[PDB]
Each structure stands twice: as C-alpha cells, then as structure tokens.
C-alpha cells in the first residue's frame, strides 16, 4: 500500500525561511517558527492563519508543543528559549543559560520539562513552571542538532555534528549509550520511535537510519533524498500506513515505507529546501515547510 498525499493548502506569511512546523497534540493547530523571529499559528485542517507570536530578538530554529496544546517553547539564535502561552501569545518565561544559538527543543510527555540543544555543544533540561535550568549535559563536542524525550520522559536522545547520537537518563544526566555507525558524518536529526524502542537518525550523507538503540544496531536505512547541508526534521507517520517522512534539499517531501525502505511518495510543490515535516496526530496529514526562496508551509492529505 502507498499513501496518496495531495496538496490541500499553501500557507504564507513568514518573511524569511521557515525553520520548523509542528502540529499541536490535540490536532487543532499548526505552529510554525521562522528566521524572521516569529511564531505563527494556523488551523491544522484548513491552514487558516490564526496569530503571530513574537518577542525573540533573533531568528527561531525550532518550536514544540506542550502535551495539553496550551504552551509552546521556541529555540532562538538569541540564545534563549521562550515558553509561550498560545492562547494569549504572551511569553511566560525566557530560558537563559546556553552560551550560543539554541537550535532544537522539546517538551517531555508530562510537559513539566523542556530539553534544548545548542551551538554551545550542550543539552539543557528546563523546569517549565519556573523557567530555570535544571541540568546541563556536556552532551557533545559540536553543535547539538536535535533533542527528543522518549515516551515517558525518562530518556533523552541527542544528535550532533560530532557524528554521535547519545541517549541520556533524564534524571541522572548519565549517558546510557553513545551510538555511531562505521562512519562519522554529522548527525543532523534524531528522535525516538513512538514505541521508544528505536531512534530515527538523519546524517548529512543523504541517509536516514532506524536504530534499535537498546541493541545498538541499525535495523533500516532510507535513501534517495538529498540531505548534506541542513538539519532536516524526519517523522514516523503512524496514523495510517507506517511511513518515514522527511524533507529534502531537492525541494521534495520524501515518504518511505518503514518496513520495506522503498520510497512510496515524493511531494512536489516547494521551491526550496523542505526543512521540516510534521505528521498530524490523528489524521493522515503532513505539514511541510521550506527555506528562503519559498518561505511557505504546505498541508498534504492522504487517504491512507
């Protein structure tokens, strides 16, 4: 079976490259972040513009939702993270402590903590209520390209240009595993599978890989796209068929069959690098966003 994703909406408004798109867990909203220093909110099902959220002083590279869809955290070049109340648009907290650009961010499932990764080569863990840095992980020896909590928040996976993926025990800070193949290309994205058993990792050699991290083994490899320059998000599409979804530097959205590794769809329309894809939590919907010769978000819908 192959998906039949088809373009439903293009969403425009950001005045510079879009960095990140994320669907709210309750499925009503898409949040977009951009080099133009702005967060924008759109309806998930029609892409209707809802509001702009602002306050960061430099461009934004990531945004993530709290589990209750009430809060957003953003990661900015201004070396801060901001906790936002979506409904009011106010900045609730400014998270300071990184000494270089903040590049990536995520809530834990309970949404009482935020993880961040920075150009300063560290991972930071933040208390959402107080906005205080709980812990700093000297996580890597190069910029941290992604950080992600597992299904219950007890683990953090980070990726870095130093070529490593590291799994951290959230509470103890201990590095439980360091993962690397037989080469060391920069790792530009990583995230746990929904079941927590795997990490999906992008490396800047045009390769995605599915690792059983417990066993420390690569179970699947996905190729055919173009990824050598940008930290492009990748997804497990789970609502219908089990796909792997990623943007690509040839301006396409790639969709692979997770089991077989075959490319099953390529979504055309973007006119620049598709930096970010997101999968709707209940509907077979993909959101994708592109860099500075495009600056738009597209919503794609599939029957399966």
């Amino acid at each position: 079976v192959k998906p039949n994703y088809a373009l439903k909406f293009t969403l425009a408004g950001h005045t510079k490259a879009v960095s990140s798109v994320k669907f709210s867990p309750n499925g009503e909203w898409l949040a977009s972040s951009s080099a133009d220093k702005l967060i924008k909110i759109w309806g998930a099902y029609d892409g209707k513009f809802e509001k702009t959220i602002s306050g960061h002083k430099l461009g934004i590279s990531d945004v993530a939702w709290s589990s209750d869809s009430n809060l957003l955290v953003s990661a900015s070049d201004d070396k801060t993270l901001k906790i936002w109340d979506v409904s009011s648009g106010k900045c609730l907290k400014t998270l300071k402590g990184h000494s270089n650009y903040v590049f990536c961010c995520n809530f834990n499932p309970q949404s009482n903590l935020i993880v961040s990764g920075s150009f300063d080569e560290s991972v930071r863990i933040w208390d959402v209520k107080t906005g205080k840095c709980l812990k700093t992980l000297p996580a890597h020896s190069d910029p941290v390209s992604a950080v992600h909590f597992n299904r219950d928040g007890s683990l953090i996976v980070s990726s870095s240009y130093d070529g490593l993926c590291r799994i951290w025990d959230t509470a103890s800070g201990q590095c439980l595993k360091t993962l690397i193949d037989d080469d060391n290309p920069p790792v530009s994205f990583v995230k746990f599978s929904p079941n927590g058993k795997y990490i999906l990792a992008a490396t800047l050699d045009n390769t995605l890989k599915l690792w059983d991290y417990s066993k420390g083994k690569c179970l699947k490899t996905y190729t055919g796209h173009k990824n050598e320059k940008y930290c492009i998000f990748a997804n497990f599409s789970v609502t219908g068929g089990k796909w792997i979804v990623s943007g690509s530097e040839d301006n396409l959205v790639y969709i692979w069959n997770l089991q077989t590794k075959e490319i099953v769809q390529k979504l055309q329309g973007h006119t620049d690098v598709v930096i970010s894809t997101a999968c709707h939590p209940t509907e077979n919907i993909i959101a994708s966003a592109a860099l500075e010769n495009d600056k738009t978000i597209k919503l794609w819908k599939s029957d399966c």
Partner: peptide
C-alpha cells in the same frame, strides 16, 4: 540558524 546551510 537551522535555515542556514
């Protein structure tokens, strides 16, 4: 910075 090569 994610938007930069």
């Amino acid at each position: 910075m994610r938007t930069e090569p």
